[PDB]
Write a protein that binds this DNA or RNA. Sequence first.
DNA 1: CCTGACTCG
DNA 2: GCGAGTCAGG
Length: 574
Amino acid sequence: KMAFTLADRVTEEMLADKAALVVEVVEENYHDAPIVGIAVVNEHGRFFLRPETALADPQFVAWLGDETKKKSMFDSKRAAVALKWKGIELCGVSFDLLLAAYLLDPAQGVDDVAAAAKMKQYEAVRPDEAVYGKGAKRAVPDEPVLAEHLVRKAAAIWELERPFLDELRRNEQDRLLVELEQPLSSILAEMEFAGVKVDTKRLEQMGKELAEQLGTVEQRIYELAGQEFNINSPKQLGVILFEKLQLPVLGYSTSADVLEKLAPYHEIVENILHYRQLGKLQSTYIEGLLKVVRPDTKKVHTIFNQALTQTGRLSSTEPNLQNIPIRLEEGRKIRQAFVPSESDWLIFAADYSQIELRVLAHIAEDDNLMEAFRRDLDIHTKTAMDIFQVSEDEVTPNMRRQAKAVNFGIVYGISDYGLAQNLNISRKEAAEFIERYFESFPGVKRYMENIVQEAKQKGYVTTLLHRRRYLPDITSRNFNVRSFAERMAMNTPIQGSAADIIKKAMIDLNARLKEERLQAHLLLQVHDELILEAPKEEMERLCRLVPEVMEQAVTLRVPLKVDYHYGSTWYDAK
DNA sequence: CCTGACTCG
DNA sequence: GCGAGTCAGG
Ligand SMILES: OC[C@H]1O[C@@](CO)(O[C@H]2O[C@H](CO)[C@@H](O)[C@H](O)[C@H]2O)[C@@H](O)[C@@H]1O
Ligand SMILES: OC[C@H]1O[C@@](CO)(O[C@H]2O[C@H](CO)[C@@H](O)[C@H](O)[C@H]2O)[C@@H](O)[C@@H]1O
């Protein structure tokens, strides 16, 4: 066993200006959740404190908020938010092991202290899952077992800080941790805690009108099929489409891509696609959303997973506010349900225009692509002009659409198969497009070749701010497995650098909002855009400040461009 | 608990 | 084709 003092009261030696701190929140969703225990490890020793006793002690609380008292933790955002819900401010977190491990190797999927420690051959700590269990069996163990687990985690963090910081320094990722990710952690904490206001009453009205339409398309489907069946059963649907109605096969696959091609054969296909759209808005964006709105404040408090994506992007859960409908008008209406939290306040949204491609232009130093952006040209029309060799005047809607698709392919790691599949054309033709694209953008071609070669030589690829991704399959003798890694080598520096940029913009924006003492604050981040809320009196100032700060986040060989809109609801901010 | 469907940048 | 999360079904 590990030695530790199971304290009954807080003592001075527990308030050293340097310590590994553990403020345990077992619940997955930490919003307004319980803190089941506390552990502190420092010069003087290892201690376990009960929350009701420590969070009531004015000295402990002052220590938690004393920024000069440095704390090392694992997932400090979790503790900070749980503490915000109790009116307690956590300050001075100088090292976060979860974020440190995430920068060192995102593929490891480090989600507990045990996994992080395993990276440095340290195993004197148990995986949280072995302690709390999971699912319907998850539970907080008795004090003895709980206290030892928390102390062991604190002791691990205490021991591992140095080794993790040393490696970060070698990787040139020390500043990435201390100046980007950790400060961002605190900003993400304020955003989650603030939450976003939902107009539940109008959301239930939409759910009512939706319920009526689904009933219509539903019965219309049973008619065209001359039989009732579970439309949501990919298995039952396959029977009705490929057996009863003899539709062509191009069990059974009824993916959206398949049905779009079957549409011309039978009227039922169109209806099944619409029914699926509406059915998705109903189950997820109506019923599912309402399930997570706080009844008392009518707010939803998302949780941004800051150490999950392989590219450095953020992810969002319970609910996922990074995938709210907008493409099809019927689903876009859902956004009229996200409103400001105060009367006379408005929603302000600012987004980078073509940041991936601008980053690509920068990194590849392609003359044509850099010139195009310097002229702030419509990138897809320009790409169409170059690959089809025609004047702007001769670009047809269909040419542009296809040049647009090629730009995606180039960004996601261009491949004969991938483009051909996306445009519903032959590979020989796709290779034809790609071929032409590289003729017009030789710089982009050189980069794709060089980055793949660099991935093979170094073993990984990096982003603008030194985030990295290891690509061991880049040397596989299996074509498919190797090709996956190659695309990643091409795409990660693009998607990854775009992530670094917007993360820094969030940090710069917040320092500016505070300098100006503006009431405006961040609500969400959707990969290449920032959503804020502020009194209407601050709109004119934000119109100049937000774009400015986002455009000046970093300096590239091409300018960064930001569009913005504001309105009464998220929907109107367009 | 795992597909196969949908949603987003 | 790159990166994500949620839900009804089986
Ligand atoms: O607190 C977020 C942080 O925790 C991890 C690991 O514990 O994920 C946990 O919390 C998420 C938000 O509720 C869940 O989606 C996830 O299933 C749960 O393990 C990290 O991945 C994350 O950075
Ligand atoms: O009780 C409803 C009953 O309807 C079936 C078809 O007869 O399913 C329809 O309605 C469901 C919603 O209640 C949808 O999920 C399903 O997609 C639609 O076909 C039966 O499965 C169900 O028992």
